[PDB]
Design a protein around this ligand. Sequence first.
Ligand SMILES: CCCCCCCCCCCCCCCCC[C@@H](O)O[C@H](CO[C@H](O)CCCCCCCCCCCCCCC)COP(=O)(O)OCC[N+](C)(C)C
Ligand SMILES: CCCCCCCCCCCCCCCCC[C@@H](O)O[C@H](CO[C@H](O)CCCCCCCCCCCCCCC)COP(=O)(O)OCC[N+](C)(C)C
Ligand SMILES: CCCCCCCC/C=C\CCCCCCCC(=O)O[C@H](COC(=O)CCCCCCC/C=C/CCCCCCCC)COP(=O)(O)OCCN
Ligand SMILES: CCCCCCCCCCCC(=O)SCCNC(=O)CCNC(=O)[C@H](O)C(C)(C)COP(=O)(O)O
Lengths: 55, 124, 459, 175, 84, 88, 63, 70, 55, 178, 128, 124
Amino acid sequence: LVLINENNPLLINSIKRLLIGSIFAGFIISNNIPPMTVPNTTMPLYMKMTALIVT
Amino acid sequence: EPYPDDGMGYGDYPKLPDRSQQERDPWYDWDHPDLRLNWGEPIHWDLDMYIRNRVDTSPTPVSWNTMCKHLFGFVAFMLFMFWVGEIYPSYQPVGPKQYPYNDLYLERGGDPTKEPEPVVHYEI
Amino acid sequence: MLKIIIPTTMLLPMTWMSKHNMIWINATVHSLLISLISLSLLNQLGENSLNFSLTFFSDSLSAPLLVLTTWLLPLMLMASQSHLSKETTTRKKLYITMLILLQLFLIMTFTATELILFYILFEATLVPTLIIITRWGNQTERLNAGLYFLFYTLAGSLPLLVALVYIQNTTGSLNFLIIHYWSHPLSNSWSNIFMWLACIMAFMVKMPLYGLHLWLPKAHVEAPIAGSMVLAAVLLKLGGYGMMRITTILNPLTNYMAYPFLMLSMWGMIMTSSICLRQTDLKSLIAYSSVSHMALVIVAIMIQTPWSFMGATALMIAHGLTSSMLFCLANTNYERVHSRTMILARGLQTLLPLMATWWLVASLTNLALPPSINLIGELFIITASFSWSNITIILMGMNMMITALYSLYMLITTQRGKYTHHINNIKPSFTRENALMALHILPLLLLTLNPKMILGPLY
Amino acid sequence: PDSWDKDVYPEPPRRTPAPAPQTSLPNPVTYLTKIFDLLVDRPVTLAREFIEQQHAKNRYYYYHREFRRVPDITECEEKDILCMFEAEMQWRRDYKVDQEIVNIIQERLKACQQREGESYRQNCAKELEQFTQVSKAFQDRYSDLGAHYSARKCLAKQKQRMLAERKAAKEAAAA
Amino acid sequence: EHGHSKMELPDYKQWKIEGTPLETVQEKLAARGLRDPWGRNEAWRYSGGFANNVSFVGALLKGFKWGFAAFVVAVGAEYYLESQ
Amino acid sequence: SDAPPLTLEAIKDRVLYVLKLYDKIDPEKLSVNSHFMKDLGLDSLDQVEIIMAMEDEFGFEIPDIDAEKLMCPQEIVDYIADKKDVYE
Amino acid sequence: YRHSIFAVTHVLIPVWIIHYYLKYHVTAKPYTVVERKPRIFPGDTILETGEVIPLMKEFPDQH
Amino acid sequence: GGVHIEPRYRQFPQLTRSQLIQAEFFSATMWFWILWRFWHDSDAVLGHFPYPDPSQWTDEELGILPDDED
Amino acid sequence: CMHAFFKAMLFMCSGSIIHSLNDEQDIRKMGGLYKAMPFTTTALIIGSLALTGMP
Amino acid sequence: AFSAPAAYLTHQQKVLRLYKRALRHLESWCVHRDKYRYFACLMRARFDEHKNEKDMVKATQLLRQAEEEFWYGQHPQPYIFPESPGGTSYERYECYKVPEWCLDDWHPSEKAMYPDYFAKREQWKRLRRESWEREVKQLQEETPPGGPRTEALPPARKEGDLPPLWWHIVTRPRERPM
Amino acid sequence: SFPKYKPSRLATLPATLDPAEYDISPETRKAQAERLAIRSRLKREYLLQYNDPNRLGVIEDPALIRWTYARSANIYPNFRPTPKTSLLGALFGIGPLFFWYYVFKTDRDKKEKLIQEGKLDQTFNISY
Amino acid sequence: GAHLARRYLGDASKEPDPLRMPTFPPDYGFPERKEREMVATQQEMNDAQLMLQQRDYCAHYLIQLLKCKRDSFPNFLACKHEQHDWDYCEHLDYVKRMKEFERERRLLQRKKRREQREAEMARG
Ligand SMILES: CCCCCCCCCCCCCCCCC[C@@H](O)O[C@H](CO[C@H](O)CCCCCCCCCCCCCCC)COP(=O)(O)OCC[N+](C)(C)C
Ligand SMILES: CCCCCCCCCCCCCCCCC[C@@H](O)O[C@H](CO[C@H](O)CCCCCCCCCCCCCCC)COP(=O)(O)OCC[N+](C)(C)C
Ligand SMILES: CCCCCCCC/C=C\CCCCCCCC(=O)O[C@H](COC(=O)CCCCCCC/C=C/CCCCCCCC)COP(=O)(O)OCCN
Ligand SMILES: CCCCCCCCCCCC(=O)SCCNC(=O)CCNC(=O)[C@H](O)C(C)(C)COP(=O)(O)O
C-alpha cells in the first residue's frame, strides 16, 4: 500500500529554507567575520588534500 | 524452595528464579501488561529490581564473558595507544614561533619596572 | 511578640464555641489571618535582633521558621478535612486543639531568649505530636511508632537538661544574648568533651543523624497526614535551630569533635539516598529523603562557616515546604487507592493530569533544580564543604545523582506507564487538593525571587 | 549621569573612531539605527519626559543616616556589657562597610576587564593590583573568624598576628 | 477532506516474473531442483516505475547538466562583460 | 498519517490478492471459505509461509499461538479486522 | 492586518518597555552596561577629541 | 495545505510536476554554486603558496661553514 | 554553526521518510525513493555531501 | 494474545516456530527480495529433508543443533515490526487509552454534550447488568469440580445468553484512540 | 560445530538452548499440567472478581500484600546473628565510616601543616 | 612527515626536537646577524587589540585587513589584496621557521661530523 506523499507546503518550505542555508551560509559566515586564527597559508600538497583523499 | 536459613531475614518466602521481568512472554494476556504480571501469582523478592525500567537479564547474541573481554580489550588498547602516541608526538618541520617585543613581555603579565632580559630574533 | 501568641491562644476558645458544621471554616480563616500578622517579623536588621522583651526575641534565623510554622496550620487543616468527615464533633475539635497547641508551642520555642525555656517548650512540642500519632492513626503500628518517637527523643534530650543547669551554675546566666557576649573557649578535657556530647546529642537525635533515624520512618508512615507534614516541615528543624543556637559555646572543641558526626552524616546521606531507590512504599521513601536532606544540613551546621549557615537555613525552609507537598500528594493518592503502595496504582497521569503536573513540580523542586531555594541551599553547603576539604565533592555529587534518580523514579512509577486495570474509583481531583498543592508550591517559587529573606543572620 | 560619583567609579575617555565609508553601497546598520531611533527612542523619551515632569510637581527628600563613633572593644572593660554591646554593633557596621568596599573594587576590576577587550591582561594591571591589596587586607582582617564571629575574636586574631610579627622582627633585628 | 475514493486493486494476472531478476533465482533453484512459490508476489517491485534504478554516482550528480549549462553561460557573460 | 480507514471488503480483497499469487494453489478453486490442510492440500510449513506473507503485506505481525490456528481466508480476515478495529 | 497588529503587540511594545528600562533604570547605576571599547586603527579620527592617529611607517610593499 | 493524492497499491505513486521541477532546480543550483566557486576560488583547495624544498637550500644562507672554520 | 544547519536538514529528511512510509524506521524496508520522493532525496543528497565535506 | 495457551508445546509447534524465526532472521540478513527468496527456498529445502523421520529420539536430537545454529547466526539486530513488542512504536499510544468507566465521572455539563452516546451507554450498561447475572451461573454450572484446568472460556449456549466475561474484552478502548 | 553460548547471571540461558524441556518424561508433563491448572484457577478468580458490575473498588491482591509484608515488616523476626551476618554488618556499617574519616583526617592534616608553613598561596580566598 | 619517521626510527640525537630548539648561538652561522624589523609599535597594536597570538611580525597587514573590512562593511568581499598580502607574509614567516629548522639540522650534522673526526684523530 504505497502512501508516498510530500506535497505539503509546510514540509517543502521548511526543507528548502535549510537547503538555502546549508548551501550558502558557510560561505557567508566565513567571509563576513573578522579573522581570529592564524591562517595555515603554506602546506604540503599531499597533506593539503588529505581530507578529500580520505573522504 | 525457600531462601537458605541464614541470618538474613528472608524466612519463608519462595526463591523464584533470578530470571528478569522484561523477557516474560510479551504476547500472553497478562493482568498487568506493563509489568508482565498475573494476579495472585507469587512475586519475586526483587521485582522492583526487574520492572523493564531497570536491569534485565535478557539473553544476548554474544556471550557475556566474550563481551566483557572484547570491551575491556578495546578500551585498554585505546588507552595504551594514546599513551604511546603521547610518547611519540607528531609535528611539522618548523622552528618555534617568534614574537617581536621581548616575546611580548609587556602584553603577557606586564611588570614593566623589571626590565627583563631582552631576547632578539635571528633573521634567516 | 504577644501580638502573635495571643491570637493563637484565642484560636482555642474560637474553635470550641463554633458551630458543629463551621469549625473548619473559622479555623482556616483565622489561621491564615494569623500568618499575615507573622509576616511583619521578616523585616530583620543587620544589627543584633528584634529584642521584644525579657522573654521573647526574634532574629533573622527565627523569622523564616516562624513564618513557615504559622503558614503550615491552614494547610494542615485542609489536609485533615478529608479523613475526618465521619468523626464526631468533639473529636474533631480535639484534633484542631492539638494542632493549635502544637503551633503555639513551636511559636514560643523559636524565640525563647532563655535556653531553659527553649528546652521546656522544645520537649512540650512532644505531647500533642504523640497524641496525634497514636490516636488518629490508621495502621496498628502507630503505637510502636509513638513509643519510638517519644523515647528516641527523650533519651537524647534528658542529658541536655543536666548540661543546661550545669552551664547556668558555672556561667551564671542562660540568656542567649549574655551567652553569646560572654562566651569563653572550652578547654580540651574529658568533662568538656562530655558537656559537648550532652549539648549536641539532644539536637542530633531529632534532626535526625544517621544511625539514630530509626524513629523517623515509623513516625512518618504511621502518622496521619497532618502529623506527617508537621513532622517533616517544622519538627525536624527544631534540632538544627537548637544546634545553630548552641554551637556558640562549644568552640574550639567542635573543631575536632565534629569528625564522627561529619563522617556519619556524609555517609548516611549516600546510604539513605540509595535506600530510597529500593522502596515499596511512598511515605517511607519521602521520609528517607527527608533524612538525607537533614544529614546534609547537619554537615553544613558542623562545618561552621557563614556560607554553611546560610545554606543550612535555606535548605531548612526549602525542604520543609517540599516534604510537606510530597506528603500531601501521597495522601491524596492513598485516599483514593486505600493501599499505600507505589506500584499498585500506575499511570495516574492519564486519569489526573493536573495532579501529574503537581507531582512533576514537586519532584523537580525536590531534585534541587535551579534557581529554586533548594539548590541555593544545596550549592552553598557544597561550596562550604569544598572549602572544608576538596574530597567532599565526591560524596556530595554522588548524593545529587542518587537524589535525581529516586525523585524521577518516584515520578515515573506513579505517573507514567499504563494504568492499572482493576481500579475504577479514581474520581477526579477535588478543588481542595489542587488548592492545597498550589498553596504549597507558590511560596517556594516566590521565595526564589527574594532569597535574602531565608538566608539567616549571616547574610 | 550624575547619579553616581565619577571618581569612585572611574571611566576612561572612551574615544571612538569616525565613519569612513570606502564604498557607495549603503550600509543597513545606519538605516536600521535611524528607523529604530525614529520609532523607539522618540516615544520612550516623550514618556520619560512626561513621567519626570509629573515627578517634579511633587518633590521630597530622604537623608543618609550618620552614625557617631563609640569606644572600641579595645577600651572596653572585662564585663561591662553595655560598652561591649556598643563596640560590637560598631564592629559589625565596620564589617559591612568593608564588605561593600571590596564589592566596589571588584566591580571596578570586572568593568575594566570587560572594557579593555583582548588587551585586558595589560591594560588593567592597576585594577588587579588594587584588588590584590584590598583582598589581602580583608583576608588579614576578617577571614577565619568563624560563623560565630565577634569583635573579641577579631581582636584576638589581631593580637596573635602582632605577636607573631613582633617576634619575627625581634629575631631579624637580633640576628 | 480525507482519502475516500474507493480505490480498486489491479488484476492479479498482470504480475509476471518476466523482465525481472527473479529469473536468475528461479533458474538457480531449478538447477538444484526446486521452485519459489512466492516469485510472482513481489514482481510488482520490479514492474512499474520502479523498474529503472540509478547508480550511486549518477544519483550524486542529480542536476549536473543544468548546473553546468548555467555555469558556462555565467562564465561567458562575465568574460564578455568584464572585457570592457 | 493520512491512512485510509481500511474496511472488511478491502481486507478480503487484499487477502485473496495475496493468496492468488501463491502458485501452489490455483486461483479458480480457492474461495473465501476454503480450507488449507484439506480443501487445498497445503503443508503446515506452507501455511506458515502464507501467514508470514500476510504479515509482510499488512505491516503487522501475528503471534505464533494465534497464527498456527488460522486455516481459512475468512477467519484470517476476521482476525485482521479484530486486530485493527474495523466497523464494516 | 494580522501581521500588522502582531508586530505591534508582540515586538514594538517589548522594545519600548525594555528600552525604557535599560535607558533610565539600568544605566542609572554605574557599570551595569559596559561596552567593549571600539578598535582604533592608524588613520581614524576620534569624535570626542578630533585628533588623527598617525599612520604606519611605510613598510616595504612588494607583492 | 496540499493536493489530494490517493494510494496506489503496487504502482508508482503520483508525482506532481511542482516537486520534480523544484528538486531539479535546487540540485542544479547546488552544482552551479560549486562550479562557480571552484572557478573563482581555486586556491582554497589546491593551495596558493608553494611548499619550499629544504634540501635545495644552499648552505650559504643557512650559516654552515665547511667543517673547518669552527 | 555549520553542523546545526546540515544535521537539522538530515533529521528533517529522515522524519519525512518515516512519516511517508507509515512510521517505518528500519532502512531494510526503504527501497526506491530516488524517484518516488524527488525533493526529499535531493535534500538528503545535498545534506550528506555537505556533511562529508564537499568543497 | 487472544487464544489461551496450552500446558506445553508439541514438537510440531517447536518446529514451526523455529522455521518462522529462521525465515525472519534470514530475511533480515538478506536485505533484498530476490536474495531472500533464493535463500528462503534453500532453507525450506534443508528444512524438509528430515520431514519424514519416524523415531522421536532422533527428531529431538535434531532441532537442538538447529537451535544452536540459529543462535550462532541470529543477526543480533533483527527486523522488528513497529507495533511488535520490540518495535519502535510498541506502546506509543498506550498513554491515550482512557478506560470506559471514566465516563461515569463526567460532570453533567459535560454529559449535556453527546446525549445520544450516553443513552446508548446506559443501554449497554443495562445489557451488561443482566448478562453478568446469567454468566456467573452458567460458568458455575459449566466448570468441572476442583477448578478449571485451562483458561479457555465457553461460548454462549442459550438464545438470550452472552459469552461469560465479555465486558472488558468487548469494551477495549481502541487500537489508536487518539 | 559452533561456539557455545555460556550463560551468566546477567545473561541467562535461552529457553531454546535449555535442555530441560528436551528430556521429557510423563512426570514433567504432569507438573506442567498442575502449573497451568493453578494459574488458570487464579486467572478465573481474578476475572470473576474483575467483570463484576457491582464492584466499585480495588481488587485486593494477596500476593502484593504478602510481598510488601515480607520485604518490610518480616525482616527482623526472622533475623539471627550468625558469623556471616555479623561480619557483613560490621564491614558494611563500620568500614566506610573509618575509611572516610581517615581520608578526610589525612587531607585536613596536610592542609593545616601547609598553612602553618605558610606555603599555600591562599590569595583571594575571601569567602569561606 | 618523513622527519618524524626518521627521528622515531633512526637516531634521536641525529636531528633536533621542536621543544629545545635552537641549540646553537645565532652568531654561529654568519657574523653580520641582521635583525628582524617590526613596523607596528606597541601602542597602535594595543589599540587595534588584535589577539595575543596574532601580535606577530605580520601584524601590520592584519591591521590593514581589519581596517579594510571595517571601512567597506556591506560588500563583505570588497578587499582581498590586503588579505592576500597578509597570507603572503604569514607564508614567508613559515618559510623562515622552516629555514631555522633546517639550519639547526645541518648545524647539528656538522657538529656530529666534527666530533666524530676529532674522536677518530685522537684514536688514530
Ligand atoms: C498600593 C499599595 C501596595 C502595597 C500594599 C501593602 C499592604 C500590606 C497589608 C498587609 C500587612 C501585613 C500585616 C502587618 C502586621 C505587622 C505590623 C503590625 O503588627 O502593626 C500593628 C498595626 O497594625 C495595623 O494597625 C492593622 C493592620 C492589619 C490589617 C492589614 C491590612 C490588611 C488586613 C486584611 C484583613 C481582612 C480584610 C477584610 C476581609 C473580608 C501594631 O503596630 P504598633 O506596634 O502599634 O506600631 C508602633 C509604631 N507606630 C507607633 C509608629 C505605629
Ligand atoms: C551509633 C549511632 C551514632 C551515635 C553517636 C556517635 C558519636 C559518639 C562518638 C564519641 C565522639 C568521640 C569520643 C572521644 C573523642 C576524644 C578523642 C579520643 O577518642 O582519642 C584518643 C583518646 O584515647 C582513647 O580514645 C581513650 C578513650 C577510649 C574509651 C572510649 C570508648 C571507645 C570505643 C567505644 C565506642 C562506643 C560508642 C557508642 C556508645 C553507645 C586521643 O588520646 P589523648 O590525646 O591522650 O586524649 C585526648 C583527650 N584529652 C586531650 C582531653 C586528654
Ligand atoms: C538516641 C540515644 C542517644 C543517647 C545519648 C546519651 C549520651 C549523651 C552524652 C553523655 C550524657 C551525660 C553527660 C553528662 C551531662 C554533662 C554535664 C557536664 O558536663 O559536667 C561534667 C561531668 O561529666 C560527667 O559527669 C560525665 C559522666 C557520664 C556518665 C553517664 C555516661 C552515659 C554514657 C556515656 C557514653 C555515651 C557517649 C556516646 C553516646 C552516643 C549515643 C548512643 C563536668 O564534671 P565536673 O564535676 O564539673 O568536674 C569539674 C572538676 N574537674
Ligand atoms: C540465519 C539463521 C539460520 C538458522 C538455521 C536453522 C537450522 C536449519 C535446519 C533445521 C533442521 C531441521 O529441519 S530439524 C527436523 C526436526 N524434526 C522433524 O521435522 C521430524 C518430523 N517433522 C514434523 O513433523 C513437522 O511437523 C513438519 C513435517 C516439518 C511440518 O509438519 P506440518 O505438516 O504440520 O507442517
